[PDB]
Enzyme design. Sequence first.
Site, PDB file in Angstrom:
ATOM      1  N   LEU A  48       7.687 -31.913  28.998  1.00 19.58           N
ATOM      2  CA  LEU A  48       6.993 -33.058  28.639  1.00 19.58           C
ATOM      3  C   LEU A  48       5.993 -32.313  27.533  1.00 19.58           C
ATOM      4  N   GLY A 156       8.069 -39.629  17.604  1.00 18.37           N
ATOM      5  CA  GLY A 156       7.187 -38.699  17.214  1.00 18.37           C
ATOM      6  C   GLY A 156       7.877 -38.157  15.601  1.00 18.37           C
ATOM      7  N   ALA A 193      -1.415 -26.378   1.461  1.00 18.71           N
ATOM      8  CA  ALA A 193      -2.533 -26.011   1.783  1.00 18.71           C
ATOM      9  C   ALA A 193      -3.387 -27.171   2.683  1.00 18.71           C
ATOM     10  N   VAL A 195      -3.991 -29.417   6.714  1.00 16.31           N
ATOM     11  CA  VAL A 195      -4.553 -29.107   7.923  1.00 16.31           C
ATOM     12  C   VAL A 195      -3.893 -27.901   8.512  1.00 16.31           C
ATOM     13  N   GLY A 197      -1.335 -25.763   7.777  1.00 18.85           N
ATOM     14  CA  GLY A 197      -1.251 -24.529   6.914  1.00 18.85           C
ATOM     15  C   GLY A 197      -2.558 -23.653   6.635  1.00 18.85           C
ATOM     16  N   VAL A 198      -3.426 -24.273   6.756  1.00 23.67           N
ATOM     17  CA  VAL A 198      -4.806 -23.876   6.599  1.00 23.67           C
ATOM     18  C   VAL A 198      -5.376 -23.049   7.905  1.00 23.67           C
ATOM     19  N   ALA A 335      -2.773 -36.629  17.155  1.00 23.76           N
ATOM     20  CA  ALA A 335      -2.518 -36.625  18.704  1.00 23.76           C
ATOM     21  C   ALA A 335      -3.204 -37.971  19.067  1.00 23.76           C
ATOM     22  N   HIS A 336      -4.670 -37.817  18.763  1.00 23.07           N
ATOM     23  CA  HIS A 336      -5.649 -38.915  19.392  1.00 23.07           C
ATOM     24  C   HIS A 336      -5.160 -40.379  18.758  1.00 23.07           C
ATOM     25  N   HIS A 459     -33.016 -30.136  21.496  1.00 23.17           N
ATOM     26  CA  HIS A 459     -33.297 -29.214  20.642  1.00 23.17           C
ATOM     27  C   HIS A 459     -33.339 -27.803  21.327  1.00 23.17           C
TER      28      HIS A 459
HETATM   29  C1  LIG Z   1       1.396 -27.193  14.323  1.00 20.87           C
HETATM   30  C2  LIG Z   1       0.703 -28.474  14.585  1.00 20.87           C
HETATM   31  C3  LIG Z   1      -0.756 -28.400  14.995  1.00 20.87           C
HETATM   32  C4  LIG Z   1      -1.216 -29.786  15.295  1.00 20.87           C
HETATM   33  N1  LIG Z   1      -2.569 -29.914  15.518  1.00 20.87           N
HETATM   34  C5  LIG Z   1      -3.109 -30.990  15.967  1.00 20.87           C
HETATM   35  C6  LIG Z   1      -4.483 -30.946  16.124  1.00 20.87           C
HETATM   36  O1  LIG Z   1      -5.280 -30.141  16.455  1.00 20.87           O
HETATM   37  N2  LIG Z   1      -5.061 -32.306  16.524  1.00 20.87           N
HETATM   38  C7  LIG Z   1      -4.161 -33.399  16.349  1.00 20.87           C
HETATM   39  O2  LIG Z   1      -4.697 -34.688  16.529  1.00 20.87           O
HETATM   40  N3  LIG Z   1      -2.920 -33.446  16.014  1.00 20.87           N
HETATM   41  C8  LIG Z   1      -2.300 -32.342  15.722  1.00 20.87           C
HETATM   42  N4  LIG Z   1      -1.102 -32.134  15.513  1.00 20.87           N
HETATM   43  C9  LIG Z   1      -0.331 -33.512  15.323  1.00 20.87           C
HETATM   44  C10 LIG Z   1       0.341 -33.759  16.672  1.00 20.87           C
HETATM   45  O3  LIG Z   1       1.063 -32.743  17.163  1.00 20.87           O
HETATM   46  C11 LIG Z   1       1.055 -35.234  16.420  1.00 20.87           C
HETATM   47  O4  LIG Z   1       0.352 -36.112  15.840  1.00 20.87           O
HETATM   48  C12 LIG Z   1       1.237 -35.820  17.813  1.00 20.87           C
HETATM   49  O5  LIG Z   1       1.944 -34.778  18.630  1.00 20.87           O
HETATM   50  C13 LIG Z   1       2.417 -36.915  17.647  1.00 20.87           C
HETATM   51  O6  LIG Z   1       2.451 -37.368  19.077  1.00 20.87           O
HETATM   52  P1  LIG Z   1       3.758 -38.450  19.170  1.00 20.87           P
HETATM   53  O7  LIG Z   1       3.595 -39.053  20.930  1.00 20.87           O
HETATM   54  O8  LIG Z   1       3.518 -39.614  18.171  1.00 20.87           O
HETATM   55  O9  LIG Z   1       4.955 -37.638  18.918  1.00 20.87           O
HETATM   56  P2  LIG Z   1       5.580 -36.018  19.511  1.00 20.87           P
HETATM   57  O10 LIG Z   1       4.509 -35.368  19.863  1.00 20.87           O
HETATM   58  O11 LIG Z   1       6.244 -35.614  18.039  1.00 20.87           O
HETATM   59  O12 LIG Z   1       6.378 -36.678  20.512  1.00 20.87           O
HETATM   60  C14 LIG Z   1       7.537 -37.014  20.477  1.00 20.87           C
HETATM   61  C15 LIG Z   1       8.443 -36.739  21.501  1.00 20.87           C
HETATM   62  O13 LIG Z   1       9.805 -37.701  21.627  1.00 20.87           O
HETATM   63  C16 LIG Z   1      10.770 -36.910  22.107  1.00 20.87           C
HETATM   64  N5  LIG Z   1      12.051 -37.726  21.511  1.00 20.87           N
HETATM   65  C17 LIG Z   1      12.140 -37.890  20.257  1.00 20.87           C
HETATM   66  N6  LIG Z   1      13.378 -38.809  20.133  1.00 20.87           N
HETATM   67  C18 LIG Z   1      13.802 -38.827  21.346  1.00 20.87           C
HETATM   68  C19 LIG Z   1      14.872 -39.504  21.927  1.00 20.87           C
HETATM   69  N7  LIG Z   1      15.774 -40.254  21.125  1.00 20.87           N
HETATM   70  N8  LIG Z   1      15.077 -39.490  23.330  1.00 20.87           N
HETATM   71  C20 LIG Z   1      14.151 -38.715  23.986  1.00 20.87           C
HETATM   72  N9  LIG Z   1      13.340 -38.317  23.531  1.00 20.87           N
HETATM   73  C21 LIG Z   1      12.949 -38.132  22.222  1.00 20.87           C
HETATM   74  C22 LIG Z   1      10.706 -35.494  21.216  1.00 20.87           C
HETATM   75  O14 LIG Z   1      11.372 -34.430  21.879  1.00 20.87           O
HETATM   76  C23 LIG Z   1       8.986 -35.167  21.747  1.00 20.87           C
HETATM   77  O15 LIG Z   1       8.915 -34.662  22.682  1.00 20.87           O
HETATM   78  C24 LIG Z   1      -0.471 -30.672  14.903  1.00 20.87           C
HETATM   79  C25 LIG Z   1       0.976 -30.650  15.027  1.00 20.87           C
HETATM   80  C26 LIG Z   1       1.460 -29.546  14.428  1.00 20.87           C
HETATM   81  C27 LIG Z   1       2.845 -29.272  14.019  1.00 20.87           C
HETATM   82  C1  LIG Z   2     -38.906 -19.555  27.758  1.00 17.54           C
HETATM   83  C2  LIG Z   2     -38.958 -21.014  27.244  1.00 17.54           C
HETATM   84  C3  LIG Z   2     -37.561 -21.682  26.764  1.00 17.54           C
HETATM   85  C4  LIG Z   2     -37.725 -22.931  26.406  1.00 17.54           C
HETATM   86  N1  LIG Z   2     -36.372 -23.537  25.992  1.00 17.54           N
HETATM   87  C5  LIG Z   2     -36.537 -24.811  25.655  1.00 17.54           C
HETATM   88  C6  LIG Z   2     -35.227 -25.339  25.167  1.00 17.54           C
HETATM   89  O1  LIG Z   2     -34.137 -24.617  25.107  1.00 17.54           O
HETATM   90  N2  LIG Z   2     -35.271 -26.637  24.546  1.00 17.54           N
HETATM   91  C7  LIG Z   2     -36.355 -27.435  24.751  1.00 17.54           C
HETATM   92  O2  LIG Z   2     -36.535 -28.551  24.163  1.00 17.54           O
HETATM   93  N3  LIG Z   2     -37.669 -26.899  25.091  1.00 17.54           N
HETATM   94  C8  LIG Z   2     -37.515 -25.523  25.682  1.00 17.54           C
HETATM   95  N4  LIG Z   2     -38.653 -25.036  26.060  1.00 17.54           N
HETATM   96  C9  LIG Z   2     -40.072 -25.840  26.061  1.00 17.54           C
HETATM   97  C10 LIG Z   2     -40.643 -26.050  24.474  1.00 17.54           C
HETATM   98  O3  LIG Z   2     -40.791 -24.674  24.151  1.00 17.54           O
HETATM   99  C11 LIG Z   2     -41.677 -26.988  24.675  1.00 17.54           C
HETATM  100  O4  LIG Z   2     -41.509 -28.093  25.157  1.00 17.54           O
HETATM  101  C12 LIG Z   2     -42.346 -27.096  23.276  1.00 17.54           C
HETATM  102  O5  LIG Z   2     -42.653 -26.015  22.479  1.00 17.54           O
HETATM  103  C13 LIG Z   2     -43.431 -28.285  23.106  1.00 17.54           C
HETATM  104  O6  LIG Z   2     -43.720 -28.188  21.758  1.00 17.54           O
HETATM  105  P1  LIG Z   2     -45.500 -28.534  21.329  1.00 17.54           P
HETATM  106  O7  LIG Z   2     -45.704 -28.844  19.883  1.00 17.54           O
HETATM  107  O8  LIG Z   2     -45.919 -29.769  22.385  1.00 17.54           O
HETATM  108  O9  LIG Z   2     -46.427 -27.336  21.853  1.00 17.54           O
HETATM  109  P2  LIG Z   2     -46.283 -25.831  21.751  1.00 17.54           P
HETATM  110  O10 LIG Z   2     -44.885 -25.467  21.226  1.00 17.54           O
HETATM  111  O11 LIG Z   2     -46.690 -25.072  23.137  1.00 17.54           O
HETATM  112  O12 LIG Z   2     -47.125 -25.561  20.477  1.00 17.54           O
HETATM  113  C14 LIG Z   2     -48.649 -25.843  20.710  1.00 17.54           C
HETATM  114  C15 LIG Z   2     -49.326 -24.913  19.655  1.00 17.54           C
HETATM  115  O13 LIG Z   2     -50.447 -25.230  19.140  1.00 17.54           O
HETATM  116  C16 LIG Z   2     -51.511 -23.914  19.219  1.00 17.54           C
HETATM  117  N5  LIG Z   2     -52.873 -24.179  19.841  1.00 17.54           N
HETATM  118  C17 LIG Z   2     -53.142 -24.660  21.023  1.00 17.54           C
HETATM  119  N6  LIG Z   2     -54.501 -24.906  20.763  1.00 17.54           N
HETATM  120  C18 LIG Z   2     -54.714 -24.886  19.663  1.00 17.54           C
HETATM  121  C19 LIG Z   2     -56.306 -24.998  19.216  1.00 17.54           C
HETATM  122  N7  LIG Z   2     -57.250 -25.381  19.594  1.00 17.54           N
HETATM  123  N8  LIG Z   2     -56.055 -24.390  17.849  1.00 17.54           N
HETATM  124  C20 LIG Z   2     -55.211 -24.232  17.148  1.00 17.54           C
HETATM  125  N9  LIG Z   2     -53.955 -24.111  17.580  1.00 17.54           N
HETATM  126  C21 LIG Z   2     -53.709 -24.278  18.858  1.00 17.54           C
HETATM  127  C22 LIG Z   2     -50.657 -22.940  20.087  1.00 17.54           C
HETATM  128  O14 LIG Z   2     -51.040 -21.873  19.678  1.00 17.54           O
HETATM  129  C23 LIG Z   2     -49.125 -23.410  19.683  1.00 17.54           C
HETATM  130  O15 LIG Z   2     -48.809 -22.868  18.506  1.00 17.54           O
HETATM  131  C24 LIG Z   2     -38.957 -23.793  26.387  1.00 17.54           C
HETATM  132  C25 LIG Z   2     -39.992 -23.163  26.843  1.00 17.54           C
HETATM  133  C26 LIG Z   2     -39.994 -21.909  27.188  1.00 17.54           C
HETATM  134  C27 LIG Z   2     -41.340 -21.217  27.601  1.00 17.54           C
END
Ligand SMILES: Cc1cc2nc3c(=O)[nH]c(=O)nc-3n(C[C@H](O)[C@H](O)[C@H](O)COP(=O)(O)OP(=O)(O)OC[C@H]3O[C@@H](n4cnc5c(N)ncnc54)[C@H](O)[C@@H]3O)c2cc1C
Ligand SMILES: Cc1cc2nc3c(=O)[nH]c(=O)nc-3n(C[C@H](O)[C@H](O)[C@H](O)COP(=O)(O)OP(=O)(O)OC[C@H]3O[C@@H](n4cnc5c(N)ncnc54)[C@H](O)[C@@H]3O)c2cc1C
Lengths: 481, 472
Positions: A48, A156, A193, A195, A197-198, A335-336, A459
């Site tokens: 399937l 298909g 060239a 989707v 093929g690329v 597919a989708h 962020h």
């Molecule tokens: C290399 C490649 C990469 C792809 N990558 C993507 C991707 O990343 N994203 C994406 O969205 N699409 C991608 N596609 C396209 C995607 O595969 C098709 O758009 C999708 O499979 C179509 O779905 P379908 O159900 O219409 O047909 P199909 O998937 O072709 O299915 C039809 C089925 O019906 C069967 N069948 C046919 N006639 C009969 C019959 N008379 N009796 C019984 N069974 C029968 C066949 O055997 C087959 O299993 C790619 C295609 C290829 C070739």
């Molecule tokens: C290890 C770590 C990982 C984190 N990872 C994430 C993450 O993945 N995603 C996320 O959303 N958040 C993350 N956070 C939280 C994020 O860093 C803070 O929420 C964010 O930096 C707050 O921004 P802010 O502008 O309010 O203050 P701050 O980033 O704390 O900046 C305040 C600034 O004001 C300056 N300052 C203070 N008082 C004065 C003054 N009187 N005069 C001049 N300058 C002054 C300081 O020097 C500083 O530069 C992380 C925090 C830590 C510690």
Amino acid sequence: VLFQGPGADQPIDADVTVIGSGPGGYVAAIKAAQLGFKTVCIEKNETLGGTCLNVGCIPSKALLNNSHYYHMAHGKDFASRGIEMSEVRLNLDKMMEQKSTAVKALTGGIAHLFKQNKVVHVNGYGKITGKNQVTATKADGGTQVIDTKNILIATGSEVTPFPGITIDEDTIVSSTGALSLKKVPEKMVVIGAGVIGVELGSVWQRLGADVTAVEFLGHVGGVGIDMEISKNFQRILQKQGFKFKLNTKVTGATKKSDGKIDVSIEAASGGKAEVITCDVLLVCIGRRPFTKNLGLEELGIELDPRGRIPVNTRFQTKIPNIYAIGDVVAGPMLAHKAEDEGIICVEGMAGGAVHIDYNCVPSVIYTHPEVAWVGKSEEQLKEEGIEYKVGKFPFAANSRAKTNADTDGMVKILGQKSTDRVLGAHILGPGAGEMVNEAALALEYGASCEDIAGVCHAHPTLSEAFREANLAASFGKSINF
Amino acid sequence: QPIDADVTVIGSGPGGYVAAIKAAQLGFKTVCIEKNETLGGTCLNVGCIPSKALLNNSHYYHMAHGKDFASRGIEMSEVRLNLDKMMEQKSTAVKALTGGIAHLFKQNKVVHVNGYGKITGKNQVTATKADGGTQVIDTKNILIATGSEVTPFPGITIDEDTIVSSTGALSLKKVPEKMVVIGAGVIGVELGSVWQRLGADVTAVEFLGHVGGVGIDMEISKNFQRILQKQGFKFKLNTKVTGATKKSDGKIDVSIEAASGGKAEVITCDVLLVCIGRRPFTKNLGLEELGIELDPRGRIPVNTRFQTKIPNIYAIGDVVAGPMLAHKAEDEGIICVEGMAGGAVHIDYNCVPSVIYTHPEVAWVGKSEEQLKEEGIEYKVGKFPFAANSRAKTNADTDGMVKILGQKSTDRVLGAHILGPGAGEMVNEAALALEYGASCEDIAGVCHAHPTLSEAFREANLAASFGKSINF
Ligand SMILES: Cc1cc2nc3c(=O)[nH]c(=O)nc-3n(C[C@H](O)[C@H](O)[C@H](O)COP(=O)(O)OP(=O)(O)OC[C@H]3O[C@@H](n4cnc5c(N)ncnc54)[C@H](O)[C@@H]3O)c2cc1C
Ligand SMILES: Cc1cc2nc3c(=O)[nH]c(=O)nc-3n(C[C@H](O)[C@H](O)[C@H](O)COP(=O)(O)OP(=O)(O)OC[C@H]3O[C@@H](n4cnc5c(N)ncnc54)[C@H](O)[C@@H]3O)c2cc1C
């Protein structure tokens, strides 16, 4: 009972009979059962899941993932992080094994979902033999009749052949052959060239092949891709080592006594004849709908000039209890797209509303960087006379991209000039494929650029580039660029 | 001599530097004062950016050094850690992004004043530089964005040598043989996982009964902890630290007990990371002389335009209430200065996402099951495991799930909780949904690209709305 293979040939009664088990058919079948229909799914292949699972999206994305990681380890990236390795070697058999394991698990998963939902799986070739009848022919020559209220055609697509070049899946391969090469070819030529093929070209380029794609048209990435995105994408790929011969036609190919292949090419308009040589020729000029021996001619269901089955907005053919969805009907061959049409089709059978906005269907290229878009390109808006504005934000200015040293590309948002309505979202860079689904959700609601800019994005995330490009489109200026 | 300004921003972290840029873009003559040698605050210099850099690099080290790459056919004979180089990559990213802020200030005509800012009048800020020189700014509005500092642990003195805050732990010069982490919140789990991957024997000691801090969904938190333990990250939950002794031989004796009492033991480590919290920083800002009182936790109370009780003096970010997150500070800064210019000022803190950048990632927005139960809200649950997601399965990266909480009567999405690959990026689709008041049915009907991790979000919403997903 729930599996009807060779030797099971009793007549069956069903409310909905789905022909094909690809993304469209197997999802339609599950959903029809969940809606309470007695549901049969007919599949001719031994597993399937159709094109996408077995020879399509799933194996290609596995090799894209693994070959990207090979490039990270073998090239400069891991070294720049303090991850020091003596020798990075490719074990292609094992990489191919990882791919095959994913496919097997997911095709088995469909079988399980069919059983869980009480979908009857008939293994055989379905032919429509009456307005309310499908006959399945099995591997042993047996036949099984299904008397059914509705028929859903989900048969298909197939590869489009190139006249005069015979695909043998040996040295002249389709995408199927290219997904299972036994060794990295020294030189590979890709015809088309698009989707597929690329993606397949990039896989083998990463693994060590010298790759050239030859394309008749003037851009990479297929129909509807935004041209600015496509040119920038092409430039990034060429820097990776992927070569392109655009505006070029292939006139023939010869398999030689040394085992290599001579591909004769010329300018698309004529002239400039050349020969290029390769070890493996991948033919991916297109895919086309598959309806062979389905019984459409005897039913009177005529195909359109490209082989598609015409359907109405409920996915009814001209015979109103016979439906069709997916790659066998118009629209992007994705597919989708097939899945969504299958769901709404059987929901409509059950009395529900039927509507799909094809302007909200995303496209994704799973290279690195990824490319993803939804809605309209600049070229489309110009064609349609729609006035628009542009916001762009480069990933070089995004904190997550910069921290990971992964800064190719940009987000480009197209907004309606007067209303700020989001008309199109175009992403080139890391994480584009996941990010475009945020854009698809915004398009569903008819959201504005200002709407998206007001959403608090975490962020540091790549998604902040999407926020900022919408801010630029709405206000005129982003914060961080 | 004095600088005249429309808006003077004190602090250049995420809240202040974004506020300053936006204020200038709105046409205010804008000054930003920063006491530290670089711009960007806690997040760029000692926070989000260096922490995510080491998380990325340590994850990739784990993939190469462990089993993952070999299973993909990427075979390496000897994988060695060069910690100096790994720290250089971190430092390079920090340097580039702090330089980017300085460039953006110039691009937007934000005047950068280096010094310690003190509010010396209702319309005046004085910056004192390190050599004692002063720069006076006469200003219409003042925006306090002075941020946060580490919360000390009473009786344990952080020295950034063997007893470190997050700042010291982001720059250890060698992998500690044994590390103890006080506090299993977001920061502690992230930094503990970094050093565990790089070879340290890591235990996090946590007073409460779950990891990941305030507001995390308990089911998510329990499943997350189970996954981290399988990786080798050890936890002592429901455990209090009573003291830590710096020993003559350079190690640390940490006394712990059950959080409720009993079971005294001593554990020894090479490095103790103290990360029990962060607290607002307002030291020597001049607030007492102005009459601006703090709330009991040290935050500056503000109104919905972010005004203090002196209406031309504002505060945003980690110095005010709400989640202490960079994107929260940035949005508050933006809307504060938009309000100064006359516009509408709205932030829905229920729509502010949280992310833990471990592998697997954790991310959530809206309400947890526990919060809905507390508030008496009737809800339904949809779940979808990444083991059933096509992209996750294809990448062989299938830990976790998406959990959706929906309102029973309206189908409104009340909360989205993601444990697994891509959670941090995926939660932004969820934040858009919550901002728009989406229903589960809405999301289930949106065409998500296949195969993507986001399909798990679609399917969990389908399960919440219809009762059943497709692929599970
Ligand atoms: C290399 C490649 C990469 C792809 N990558 C993507 C991707 O990343 N994203 C994406 O969205 N699409 C991608 N596609 C396209 C995607 O595969 C098709 O758009 C999708 O499979 C179509 O779905 P379908 O159900 O219409 O047909 P199909 O998937 O072709 O299915 C039809 C089925 O019906 C069967 N069948 C046919 N006639 C009969 C019959 N008379 N009796 C019984 N069974 C029968 C066949 O055997 C087959 O299993 C790619 C295609 C290829 C070739
Ligand atoms: C290890 C770590 C990982 C984190 N990872 C994430 C993450 O993945 N995603 C996320 O959303 N958040 C993350 N956070 C939280 C994020 O860093 C803070 O929420 C964010 O930096 C707050 O921004 P802010 O502008 O309010 O203050 P701050 O980033 O704390 O900046 C305040 C600034 O004001 C300056 N300052 C203070 N008082 C004065 C003054 N009187 N005069 C001049 N300058 C002054 C300081 O020097 C500083 O530069 C992380 C925090 C830590 C510690």
